[PDB]
């Protein structure tokens, strides 16, 4: 039985807490957060063994097998490192690291300590995305993939820390792009990136990029687009399309639920938009990959099953983003080495 | 651990076998089928303890706690009765009975033997339908429901037995209407039916009805429509709409998955239509309510938790259908007693 | 050049005025309305020769070739009769008459005076509905039609007169049903109605029906449904579906425009809902059949071309509704003669 | 009455012939084509005054006021020049020119001869796109536009000439991009482009690009994407999305018609895909902008009304594409001058 501690009790701490609570092969042992009231809140919502106000004490506890790190991005590196060094397995919310060396160093460290290190690329475990990838891999029907596009848009992060280079490590390209990139590669069966191009925008007044377009050229000839935004109203969008020589497939997470509803007021449990026509959500957490992701990690820690999607894939997406940032600066298409095509 | 035997190893035996095999609180003990090779095959797909070629022996086994009956409708009454008399809990695939007296007799019987009797109204446990119901019950946003419509259409049953009055008990009105009716009433919080009206059609040449419309007048003033068909091409449809004084809720099961795909050929894993634009499916079993339904039954047997949706609800739908059949024959709107409004 | 006068300057007077103004083969000569300020308004918006405050004077004018009657339903009979007797051709907004004898009498009268009498069954001239009918008539692809359903729903008429039996002649069944029925028959190439069944509802507090379901059985075996409502929020709905032995076709007028838009505020020229996700409209008038309808009438008056869709079709739909009203009262399925099937 | 000659009697000659034949303010005088049987055939479909086998004779005819040039792109420059020099007004199908100097030279020329020169940017006159633009220009609802994306994809041109650099002038970027670019700029009220970035692909084996992405940075801060493909199956796509600080607008031409249909066979009048679920089309020519475009040109020639959208706009799009081609070659983001940002 896999004994889990959740580091950081904000939005994603809550998502992971729910999943763990529900997983028969695991137990929610601890909730930690710099703000101890937020940790208590959550230990209670999900019947965690305790709320741990102390980081040192959390790491020292020999009962905890696995930590899930859902703190701001700037902190991932330091805490994942500390947690591995304390002998705990770690799942870190994306971005696993704010730079490729940070990621490389964590992967290296996990090995030293013979630990499972996983990252929060949930959409790659989303049952509907998994299905989508099967269909593109159906060569008779689909042919050779030549285009993949992933769109991730919302009205921006609300936590202050996401506004700071020091705390967030990056703007919308890192927050959302990391996922879009990870998905583009995964959808094409781990395609090798040969070049990267990107432009960034600051749409909102004063600074981190709110909107970005990143484009990858892959070995097989295909091209991948990542279009992400902090600055799009009317509801979170997560979509993808893959186009081949013979087929197409299209995936829609938040408006592909099969539910529409209308009211003047707003419906009790329907985030946003509240009013008029909305697309209520059902099993959002499952649909998004979290149950499956966490289950994989739990099965990995519990019975040394290898991860289907490992932190090497985080290193690749980090290199892509780093190269994307540099491409924007220089106004050029670059190879992963930083060199101008 | 709830020890389960699956009676009838066709299509739905397989669906239920899967769900049981995955449920940590249950074990798939036996698979029975008049055709023993079909039972062997399924015991193997899903690692059942054994294939039981004998019905008497199955009933006599004190190891089996619960039977799931997935045989043709004509056989439900007799086998559920026999199984209850042998002291086994029973989940019967809908229609629970081919007439209201058949249903009544089974409910009575289960009480006599202090047994859990459940029926296969899966859509009522479908997470997206559950969500839909919450929204209609949100009186501030939705207001008073005045119209509910459920549509169930396909290109007709593939098994020969579905062509026979003795084996099927009925045509499309019983095969599909049962579900549509059950949903209408459940979506309106168990609304009482005061009248019923129906017309049936025989679209295909020679006989059981292959298309039907049934309309219910409810106590609170609302009207429910059930539109079902065996004779609709281009893919199974299951949709629902609820309309209130203030709101609307629309639900779409088979084309509310958020996946579209196109090929000339057809995609290896995609039932039908095969070619051109299709709407592939993800977790169809979960989406349809089966994991949740069966979980409720397993929790009901395992720790005497009352069923959220019991066989009383099957008696009501049976009365509605019986009344529907009679209404068509007489050309009139009827009360549940058979009397002409 | 066809010289036109528009009787009644409310909503539909405005629609017809626009169409006429734009038609190269016609001229907008006069606008009449009991309220002369409303007539002046409209003569001005669309550059009509004059506003005519007097009905007697309007009828007497030898310049006017054609009147378009867009007054409340109770008045159609009397004014169409007066206008025909004055030698003017007439297009009457639906319902052409509030009863079948009223319709029969007008058709008879038009003949006496050798006049073109047309009615406002615009959707039957809607280019997208026309296309839909071609596809159903494509026997190789579609097969034999066995089901047709037309849905017409909105949040109800806003003019007071629509609340009065004397002024409106009927509730939602007559206001909306007339169209739905007309469309069902037309979509199936003028199918003969063998029976009719209907239930009506009063959803809003005190009285005319706000919501109705009417069902037709046709000669060829097909069944038609008309589902109409004054009591549906979130935006006017006009949809249709036809299902055959081999095909299906689905038609969507107001959310089949290919435009979505989102705002908090509301967008200047986007009726309703105003706020959140909306489906703006483009060329609504054309899309709805009015340009084509009126053009047919103009071509009929201008160069004695026969009408593609005549006022005989209004007599049939009147008989259907009359029989629908009676069916509801008696609780039975009826033949067009009033006789109980 | 504006007397028109249609140069080139292929697909688009036919589209334009139809529109002209229907326009009360114009007459279809002549059809010319190097292939005189193709010209005869079209003169007949649409009741043209004559088929003109000779180009010199066509230009010399003082009866012809306006030529519509629907020949392959390579020929536009030479024939528009010759036609202007002969004193004829000209509408040239896009691309107006195969390079900016070609376009510039034509604009210059038309001024010299006091002639109306228009180009075939039809989507810019598409009523549904016009509507879309109003909505984005609704600053209260929409805010400041920061992203515009136009997608144009199909399975590639069917005429042989489109395979040749000399005859086509270019691949998919010029054939489709021209329209996508033109739309991006028009949707943002004629926005000034400050930089351009592009990658091209050759998906099909041996050469002209069959897929492209082009990205524009505009003066006001906004970013435009043009995604075009010759190598996308399952049906022509033409879509657009505009995103602002407060709103979004989405437009869909070919699957925003509100018609769906299904058959096994294929429906007699439904291009492609033929089989399974399709999206039949209604008034495709109107919906695409051609009636309105040609009407503007006819009103411009007939009564010297300035064009709402002139050939200056074609020079801008040409500069963008030229810059796009160069950007791909150099691997860099460029200014319109060719200089590296
Ligand atoms: N998978 C996804 O789709 C997704 C979605 C949103 C966010 N995220 C990622 O998840 C992580 C957390 O995001 P979130 O939106 O829940 O943020 P949040 O602001 O809602 O939660 C963060 C919490 O951590 C706390 N915290 C701050 N410093 C800390 C410290 N030193 N030790 C412990 N706790 C500390 C804060 O008080 C806050 O309660 C981020 O890395 C982000 O990139 C992922
Ligand atoms: N709720 C739903 O979603 C849903 C969907 C489909 C079917 N069903 C229901 O499930 C039931 C079975 O449907 P199916 O599609 O699986 O039929 P099927 O043809 O696939 O399977 C029937 C099986 O039962 C076996 N069988 C027949 N008579 C038997 C007997 N007397 N004893 C033991 N085994 C016997 C057959 O050999 C066959 O293997 C039906 O009652 C149907 O109404 C429900
Ligand atoms: N085709 C459609 O889809 C559609 C839609 C709405 C209404 N209609 C029909 O069109 C007709 C008019 O509907 P509307 O919504 O414009 O109503 P409206 O109330 O907007 O307009 C009616 C106008 O006629 C005037 N009027 C009243 N008595 C009159 C008289 N004796 N002489 C002249 N004018 C008089 C009123 O002052 C008002 O200005 C109705 O018959 C209705 O059934 C059709
Ligand atoms: N705006 C749009 O929506 C759109 C759509 C499709 C095509 N187009 C454009 O329209 C133009 C024609 O396209 P199409 O698809 O009709 O090509 P097509 O193959 O259908 O027609 C070309 C015709 O021109 C004739 N022709 C060739 N050379 C000629 C010459 N030198 N003089 C006279 N006639 C000649 C050919 O015999 C043929 O009949 C192209 O420039 C293309 O870019 C525009």
Automatic annotation (TrEMBL), chains A, B, C, D:
<feature type="binding site">
    <location>
        <position position="93"/>
    </location>
    <ligand>
        <name>NADH</name>
    </ligand>
</feature>
<dbReference type="InterPro" id="IPR000683">
    <property type="entry name" value="Gfo/Idh/MocA-like_OxRdtase_N"/>
</dbReference>
<feature type="binding site">
    <location>
        <position position="12"/>
    </location>
    <ligand>
        <name>NADH</name>
    </ligand>
</feature>
<feature type="binding site">
    <location>
        <position position="12"/>
    </location>
    <ligand>
        <name>NAD(+)</name>
    </ligand>
</feature>
<feature type="binding site">
    <location>
        <position position="290"/>
    </location>
    <ligand>
        <name>NAD(+)</name>
    </ligand>
</feature>
<feature type="binding site">
    <location>
        <position position="11"/>
    </location>
    <ligand>
        <name>NAD(+)</name>
    </ligand>
</feature>
<dbReference type="GO" id="GO:0000166">
    <property type="term" value="F:nucleotide binding"/>
</dbReference>
<feature type="binding site">
    <location>
        <position position="94"/>
    </location>
    <ligand>
        <name>NADH</name>
    </ligand>
</feature>
<dbReference type="InterPro" id="IPR050463">
    <property type="entry name" value="Gfo/Idh/MocA_oxidrdct_glycsds"/>
</dbReference>
<feature type="binding site">
    <location>
        <position position="33"/>
    </location>
    <ligand>
        <name>NAD(+)</name>
    </ligand>
</feature>
<protein>
    <submittedName>
        <fullName>Dehydrogenase</fullName>
    </submittedName>
</protein>
<feature type="binding site">
    <location>
        <position position="94"/>
    </location>
    <ligand>
        <name>NAD(+)</name>
    </ligand>
</feature>
<feature type="binding site">
    <location>
        <position position="73"/>
    </location>
    <ligand>
        <name>NADH</name>
    </ligand>
</feature>
<feature type="binding site">
    <location>
        <position position="122"/>
    </location>
    <ligand>
        <name>NAD(+)</name>
    </ligand>
</feature>
<feature type="binding site">
    <location>
        <position position="76"/>
    </location>
    <ligand>
        <name>NADH</name>
    </ligand>
</feature>
<feature type="binding site">
    <location>
        <position position="122"/>
    </location>
    <ligand>
        <name>NADH</name>
    </ligand>
</feature>
<feature type="binding site">
    <location>
        <position position="76"/>
    </location>
    <ligand>
        <name>NAD(+)</name>
    </ligand>
</feature>
<feature type="binding site">
    <location>
        <position position="79"/>
    </location>
    <ligand>
        <name>NADH</name>
    </ligand>
</feature>
<dbReference type="Pfam" id="PF22725">
    <property type="entry name" value="GFO_IDH_MocA_C3"/>
</dbReference>
<feature type="binding site">
    <location>
        <position position="290"/>
    </location>
    <ligand>
        <name>NADH</name>
    </ligand>
</feature>
<feature type="binding site">
    <location>
        <position position="33"/>
    </location>
    <ligand>
        <name>NADH</name>
    </ligand>
</feature>
<dbReference type="GO" id="GO:0016491">
    <property type="term" value="F:oxidoreductase activity"/>
</dbReference>
<feature type="binding site">
    <location>
        <position position="73"/>
    </location>
    <ligand>
        <name>NAD(+)</name>
    </ligand>
</feature>
<keyword id="KW-0547">Nucleotide-binding</keyword>
<feature type="binding site">
    <location>
        <position position="93"/>
    </location>
    <ligand>
        <name>NAD(+)</name>
    </ligand>
</feature>
<dbReference type="InterPro" id="IPR036291">
    <property type="entry name" value="NAD(P)-bd_dom_sf"/>
</dbReference>
<feature type="binding site">
    <location>
        <position position="161"/>
    </location>
    <ligand>
        <name>NADH</name>
    </ligand>
</feature>
<feature type="binding site">
    <location>
        <position position="79"/>
    </location>
    <ligand>
        <name>NAD(+)</name>
    </ligand>
</feature>
<feature type="binding site">
    <location>
        <position position="11"/>
    </location>
    <ligand>
        <name>NADH</name>
    </ligand>
</feature>
<keyword id="KW-0560">Oxidoreductase</keyword>
<dbReference type="Pfam" id="PF01408">
    <property type="entry name" value="GFO_IDH_MocA"/>
</dbReference>
<feature type="domain" description="Gfo/Idh/MocA-like oxidoreductase N-terminal">
    <location>
        <begin position="2"/>
        <end position="118"/>
    </location>
</feature>
<feature type="binding site">
    <location>
        <position position="161"/>
    </location>
    <ligand>
        <name>NAD(+)</name>
    </ligand>
</feature>
<dbReference type="InterPro" id="IPR055170">
    <property type="entry name" value="GFO_IDH_MocA-like_dom"/>
</dbReference>
<feature type="domain" description="GFO/IDH/MocA-like oxidoreductase">
    <location>
        <begin position="129"/>
        <end position="250"/>
    </location>
</feature>
């Amino acid at each position: 039985p896999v004994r889990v501690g959740v580091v950081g009790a904000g939005f994603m701490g809550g998502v992971h807490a729910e999943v763990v609570a529900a997983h028969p092969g695991a137990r929610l042992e601890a909730v930690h957060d710099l703000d101890p009231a937020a940790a208590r809140d959550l230990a209670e919502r999900f019947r965690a063994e305790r709320a741990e106000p102390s980081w040192a004490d959390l790491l020292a506890d020999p009962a905890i097998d696995l930590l899930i790190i859902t703190t701001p991005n700037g902190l991932h590196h330091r805490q994942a490192a500390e947690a591995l060094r304390a002998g705990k397995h770690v799942l870190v919310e994306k971005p696993l690291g704010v730079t490729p060396e940070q990621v490389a160093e964590l992967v290296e460290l996990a090995g030293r300590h013979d630990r499972v290190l996983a990252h929060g690329s949930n959409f790659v475990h989303s049952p509907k995305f998994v299905r989508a990838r099967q269909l593109v891999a159906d060569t008779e029907a689909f042919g050779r993939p030549h285009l993949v596009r992933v769109v991730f848009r919302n009205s921006g992060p609300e936590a202050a820390w996401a506004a700071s280079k020091d705390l967030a490590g990056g703007g919308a390209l890192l927050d959302l792009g990391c996922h879009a990139v990870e998905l583009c590669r995964w959808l094409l069966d781990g395609a090798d990136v040969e070049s990267v191009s990107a432009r960034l925008q600051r749409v909102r007044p004063p600074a981190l990029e709110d909107q970005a377009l990143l484009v990858m050229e892959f070995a097989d000839g295909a091209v991948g687009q990542c279009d992400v935004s902090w600055v799009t109203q009317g509801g979170e969008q997560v979509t993808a399309e893959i186009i081949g020589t013979k087929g197409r497939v299209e995936v829609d997470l938040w408006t592909g639920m099969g539910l529409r509803a209308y009211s003047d007021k707003g419906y009790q449990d329907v985030w946003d938009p509240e009013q008029g026509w909305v697309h209520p959500e059902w099993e959002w957490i499952r649909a998004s990959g979290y149950y499956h992701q966490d289950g994989t990690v739990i099965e990995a820690v519990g019975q040394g099953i290898p991860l289907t999607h490992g932190p090497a894939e985080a290193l690749a997406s980090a290199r892509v983003l780093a190269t994307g940032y540099r491409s924007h600066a220089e106004g050029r298409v670059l190879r992963l080495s930083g060199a101008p095509v």
